[PDB]
């Protein structure tokens with residue numbers, strides 16, 4: 304997409320050479336923001352085909368609050384396979400913190416139920432937030448949350464959401480992360496009876512891996528296509544009742560997918 | 568400063584007229600990002616006289632982990648006085664979370680000491696983060712954090728910092744928050760033998776209260792002056808040992824102070 308393709312070119316032109324924990328290099332910048340008006344269309348990258356299948360399964364898995372990858376296994380989603388332990392456990396990563404953030408005194412906080420009630424009873428709140436950044440549980444996680452904190456906002460009947468992404472693999476993770484959050488906004492807008500507003504994406508350490516450079520150069524030579532349109536075929540009773548088949552993307556016409564080596 | 572007046576002009580030109588928790592009335596935009604290269608000068612607003620006295624006191628108080636206004640009220644700092652209980656307590660707000668985030672297993676994490684060690688030993692880490700967003704303890708706090716989460720980053724010997732400010736009073740709070748974090752960045756860079764890089768400010772619900780409108784347009788009729796300069800006079804043994812008198816501002820020649828009323 305245009306903002307996506309400008310950010311890629313910005314990392315190339317001004318990123319500085321950095322080394323990651325894996326000994327692979329990166330070109331990196333710090334501080335970047337893009338805004339997607341979801342009424343202009345579903346923000347799925349069109350300069351390389353992006354499969355939504357796993358994105359959709361992951362989001363539902365998150366909202367259900369389980370962190371073991373058996374559900375992903377049941378639908379053959381393998382994006383989390385390498386962090387899981389022998390029992391398929393990730394520790395208390397995203398979904399555990401979204402639905403059951405553990406308190407000092409033994410209880411759990413359901414941040415999705417909270418934001419849904421704030422959106423419905425107090426939509427002008429300035430603290431309609433969900434944080435995955437549970438400092439006291441970072442050491443138990445298979446990985447520290449990348450897409451770390453998000454906030455919702457309502458204006459003129461429209462629901463917007465901003466994500467702070469402390470660490471961003473521009474080529475491989477970003478298209479995935481942008482779709483995931485746009486998806487959730489549509490879902491929440493429907494459950495709160497709102498229209499969709501903007502998806503504001505803000506990055507911390509925003510980088511392109513050194514072995515993503517040919518694929519980036521190839522992707523910058525293509526021209527973006529008009530954005531697709533998301534169709535939710537059925538309005539379920541609550542935000543926790545979506546099923547994979549509820550979502551359809553229409554008008555998606557991407558250039559060919561581009562394969563990139565994944566860095567562990 | 569230029570970035571600061573551009574943000575005021577943006578809220579006035581794009582903002583949505585809404586109300587506050589008290590119902591006061593705001594003009595707000597959702598999502599914004601701006602940058603201050605700290606080698607250009609210490610980002611203290613000059614379109615109205617701002618006093619660094621209180622900001623320094625508040626930051627040393629935060630850094631001690633303190634949440635009682637006693638130290639602030641001794642040094643005639645009254646900015647927290649309306650939130651404090653009859654004992655002067657604010658609850659586990661900012662400084663408590665910075666220095667002793669309570670984990671579910673009964674540990675306490677010192678986030679500042681953690682980012683200090685990560686700056687010295689793993690400056691390329693993509694998780695050098697301090698979060699005040701302790702979901703579990705928000706409702707024990709006199710108010711939920713405004714300047715909720717910040718991240719450090721190092722490139723070419725310079726220390727940068729990005730803050731995610733989930734609610735921003737642009738006219739009254741913002742000048743104080745930008746100067747607070749820029750002072751923090753100078754202190755950390757001093758402790759890690761780094762030079763200062765950029766302060767990146769990102770906002771969530773970013774608003775002007777409607778009783779600050781004439782003050783805001785008064786400010787907007789003035790030209791930004793040249794940025795003052797910060798001189799630190801000593802290199803204390805740790806980031807926790809700075810004193811008020813180690814800090815000097817040079818070249819500060821602001822337009823006149825502009826008073827305005829605060830929100831409850």
Ligand SMILES: *SCCNC(=O)[C@H]1CCCN1S(=O)(=O)c1ccc(C)cc1
Nearest residue numbers: 382383386445446449472475476479480
């Ligand atoms: S575990 C270290 C950082 N990686 C991640 O969190 C990965 C694990 C699977 C999902 N995320 S992702 O960054 O959103 C992602 C998604 C898809 C691909 C191909 C790579 C990364």
Ligand SMILES: *SCCNC(=O)[C@H]1CCCN1S(=O)(=O)c1ccc(C)cc1
Nearest residue numbers: 646647650709710713739740743744829
């Ligand atoms: S407790 C409700 C929100 N108010 C604050 O968090 C205040 C208390 C003092 C620090 N903050 S502030 O938003 O940074 C601020 C600073 C200075 C003035 C004059 C007003 C508000």
